[PDB]
Subunit: 378 residues, 4 copies
């Protein structure tokens, strides 16, 4: 019923009987007295925790979904979902997914899962990939990182469901403020809440948001058995960051747009990548599925060695991760995509001098000035 910004503040904000705490108290207890529960629901912290459930309820509400489950990290959420793929079955994804996701694909392949990478940006590429026998899961990360191409969630989902397959979107990049995979036709939204959801670079976490009750049971059973559960204090921090998610994302987007214009005016910048550009190859898909184009920007630096440029920022921080209040810069070839061969990177279109920006909430003019200073050198 409540709109999105209200859901961020009040979703899962369960009342405290007797005392009336507006902010729910933090449930750190690992164990529970059984005899004084009218309807015994709480037994042991790995299985049940009120603070964790409140965060879950909040996240589910952001997508008007019945279910969410949180995890110790984004990788743990992914690993859980992927554990449901059985020997002989096939997962179709794209060869530009997050390295952590690809690492889990590798493990799945050890366990008799056929991993099929595909181009999911053309009708022919989609058609080919989705014809795989025993197709169990289609894995969409959109926008992709660091080239920021997109995949038509609704179209891939329609075609995947004709094959009986489950569709997950890793929605970490966009956050539910900007993109709603379940509304688009997908079955699962996957997040690293470590990024923009928690938003303050001070907690690790993951989440799955979905509607299927059978999936829910399998996911909860796996979390309980594998024990990849987040702590109560961590859930408190994720929940606390969540209040400002909409305000932060919109600030980040507005600034990214400013930085994109700076970049397009620089003599030492080549190609600029941003989902919001009108010449973006999938601009129509961007317009149809994203309420705004996001806070990640990438560009080809032409002024010399990228590693020298990285040392010149005095406001952007050089490091990995994204979505936080502090603006970050990295060079994928030297950092996030370093474990790949130079050949694989060239094949992926990731040039040695491609630079990636994760825009924080600092003043846009300070960020633009820092960027311009770095680019000009001297």
């Amino acid at each position: 019923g409540m709109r999105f910004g209200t859901r961020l503040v009040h979703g899962g904000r369960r009342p405290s009987a007797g005392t009336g705490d507006v902010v729910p108290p933090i449930h750190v207890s690992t164990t529970y007295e059984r005899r004084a529960q009218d309807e015994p629901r709480y037994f042991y912290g790995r299985g049940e925790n009120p603070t964790r459930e409140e965060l879950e309820e909040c996240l589910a509400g952001l997508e008007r979904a019945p279910f969410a489950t949180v995890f110790s990290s984004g990788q743990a959420a992914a690993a859980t979902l992927l554990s449901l793929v059985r020997p002989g079955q096939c997962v179709v994804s794209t060869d530009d997914v997050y390295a952590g996701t690809d690492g889990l694909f590798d493990l799945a392949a050890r366990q008799g899962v056929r991993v099929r990478y595909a181009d999911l940006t053309t009708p022919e590429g989609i058609a080919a990939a989705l014809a795989e026998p025993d197709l169990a899961l289609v894995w969409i990360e959109t926008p992709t990182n660091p080239l920021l191409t997109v995949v038509d969630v609704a179209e891939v989902s329609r075609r995947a469901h004709e094959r009986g397959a489950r569709v997950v979107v890793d929605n970490t990049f966009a956050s539910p403020v900007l993109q709603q995979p379940l509304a688009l036709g997908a079955d699962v939204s996957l997040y690293s809440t470590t990024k923009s959801i928690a938003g303050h670079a001070d907690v690790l976490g993951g989440a799955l948001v979905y509607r299927d009750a059978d999936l829910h049971a399998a996911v909860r059973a796996y979390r309980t058995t594998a024990g990849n559960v987040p702590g109560a204090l961590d859930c408190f921090l994720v929940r606390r960051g969540l209040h400002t998610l909409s305000l932060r994302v919109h600030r980040q987007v507005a600034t990214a747009r400013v930085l994109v214009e700076r970049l397009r005016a620089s003599p030492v910048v080549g190609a600029v990548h941003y989902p919001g550009l009108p010449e973006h190859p999938q601009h129509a898909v961007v317009k149809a599925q994203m309420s705004a184009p996001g806070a990640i920007v990438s560009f080809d630096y032409l002024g010399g060695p990228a590693e020298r440029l990285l040392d010149r920022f005095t406001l952007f921080t050089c490091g990995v991760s994204l979505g936080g209040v502090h603006s970050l810069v990295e060079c994928p070839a030297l950092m996030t995509h370093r474990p790949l061969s130079a050949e694989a990177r060239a094949r992926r279109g990731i040039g040695e001098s491609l630079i990636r920006l994760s825009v924080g909430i600092e003043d846009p003019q300070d960020l633009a000035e820092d960027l311009s200073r770095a680019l000009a050198g001297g």
Copy 2:
């Protein structure tokens, strides 16, 4: 370098040598090894703490000031500043200050401090009040609560300084995002950080921000001896909330303006108080010293008992405090100003049907709809 929104994120964000943490680690240690420091700076947690210091550096930076000191609560910040006034000396304040401030005034009065209240909104009231002998401190809270009247900080500061007095502004209401007391000529900005600065209703804290080094030494000596220091985990929470202060405040103000228009349109609303209204009795001062008119709104409800109105809200929370992400509603006569007598409230213009809103960051249309449903109800 650093404009305001940048200072919120990076003010006091000291590098971690060796490990390189972007978010500085939380220093919970009460105790320090003497032999492990090049120069002996850290001795004991009550006196020194890096996490507390980082918060202070951030706060000072928001007003481009050399000094800040944080406290276990806003009351503690106020108590510290007040402790500097000697018996036989006089504090001049507005009649409508925070009850906690008045509680501190009463406490000081029993030590021999003279407390004089005055109308600081008129040139005659200012001239009268500042003519009190032994004037040591002029205490300005603006806008006031719950009537949202406004005092000209620059003007009162110019006159107070001619009398050699220190000027403090309780700037909790506006936050440094909207009002800069030191730039307006005051000597000290006082904050309850419990409110908008931390902003998530999950930690108590206070702060003083100022420029005078002698004041700095006196303030720190008192905090150390009185022991009204905040914990490191609390400073961490305040600092974390600070990141989004400007985004929060601007959302809150934009929604407050929306709610003000809903109130004005309602046939069961009498007076509406908001510093942004053209007919606000101090509109010119508001325009001169506040960058936006804030997120507190108050109004007289005409449609029946205040209690019945309060029962009808389903999004606004009925409680005290303000500045947080959750929207709050209160009836001063029944809640915050309940200690005063009925006669005292009348004298102060706080009527039984005066309602106060503290606007949060929820969707403006959800908040507007909740308010309208409440106004239109009748049981």
Copy 3:
């Protein structure tokens, strides 16, 4: 450093500049590259100094070169099991923790062969270790809730002749009472949720070991599976760890008092405790455990177990163990309820078997609560 000193100072990394005695809590998920001489901190899932300090402390308690912590005991166990290939064999006992058995089932659905055996007799051991492609021998000792014991040194000897890794789930005893690595095992496994953190306010797991290749594999899996604990959680475990020896010794001393109370009760039948002189593996307990632990179980004779549970006013009725608060449960109604009555009888878990987890309350208060509850 001796044991008690290692609890306080293990992993207590100096704060250069400031001199913090208690190391500051590193909550940052991300790291500036240019601020490190030679960069070793990149991202919180991979690296975190607070987590590393806890790991260094834990490793120190067993004089071992390595430790890795996890979001839970289950996650530590899952990590170790992930190194067993389909077709290969894990040998364990049928009375292993239900969570461990849940993980065995998960592994078995990937094609891991799980064989259960009697590891308390030479013939049972010989038959178990005869399994081809034996990769891992999983020892939980003492067992719960009957408190039987497996000879770690003897089983490890035989297992190593077959080239197998040996892990001991040492949660029950803690490293204060039992040192699996010194006894010959390859890995100590812990739910730090229990006695290690000790205050029932944080979930966590740990593996402690000496093999460098194992180390690389365990870390690679934790990074990829993402089953990492939070920094604030590591702080709570580390903080609880300071008093582990003091807590355990209080708990054992009280457990011993409660055992004699139970043996004197006309409404109590069999009493189980690793320290009783007629315990069937008494020789092994003595050679293997410096003290017999803080868990007690007994057969209640005085009426329905639910009514017994309803009569405690100091013991708390709930699961978990090892904490400062004393807990009581009835396995048939609680921990082992998901079993059939037939399976429980075969395991020797009677309908009126009661289990106590002794906390650090005054022993006289606990003894009086117990007697009052028993109503003998």
Copy 4:
């Protein structure tokens, strides 16, 4: 319940509905008024359940009806002192904590009469309590760093004839070892920063008392001066409290061992410890303290204190006390540095007087570190 049980369960309020054994941490500053059966919780500075639970625990350790906790020990002290009116007189000892003297100085500038006395002699007492408008008698026992002791029961008797309130700053001993209220005092004052929280990771203070009028004044002051602790801090103090008794007894046991080491060292002169038979007030120690504490001091004869301080590799050289980590300091160089050398001379604080605060490390490790330092 008995003492060790009170540490674990004192203030351990039921979580209705959910059943949390460890109570959840109440961080909310504000409360919904319509959701309360009868409005008790309005605002965090005035009311907070986590804080109240800690207060309930602390009161219970002295079988007292009231306790109030503060942001620090100084804040508790400041609160109690605010109740003394200008023109009234506080009597204290010449050697109280420097923070207490700072508060005395603040009070003296408000017009309070401060009088220092020897509360060790019957003459020093009778002279002190003859002060005209005597409102408060301030006892710190044992004293720091010479560890002299004042008879609480005797001073309290005489002070009560004069109608004065009596407080004991009982930080040194903790409620495990000394019960000021049972001894006849009106208030127990604590820095909970020290042994009560016990892990050197939180600041706090507490007052424990029985008088309802005092209770109202104390709460009105705290609410107005706003010297309130945070919820997370109260959680940490409360969590540390569980093990207070176990820790204190470990510390005392080790202190006795260190005292024996000191007595046999040729570079040690006088040794101060309340448990020594030669202690000038040993009878009073025996009557007032269940054990003689965890603090030891001694004269180092081997040269300047720096020579000794630099050699410790286990003891940490820093201020504070009562924590799990053993600490060493030289009062003249550190805690009592602001004093002139003349003032220290008069107080009997020598330039090479050393003070040990014994933690919970293994006693033989601590003894060895001390001997190594002494030997060079």
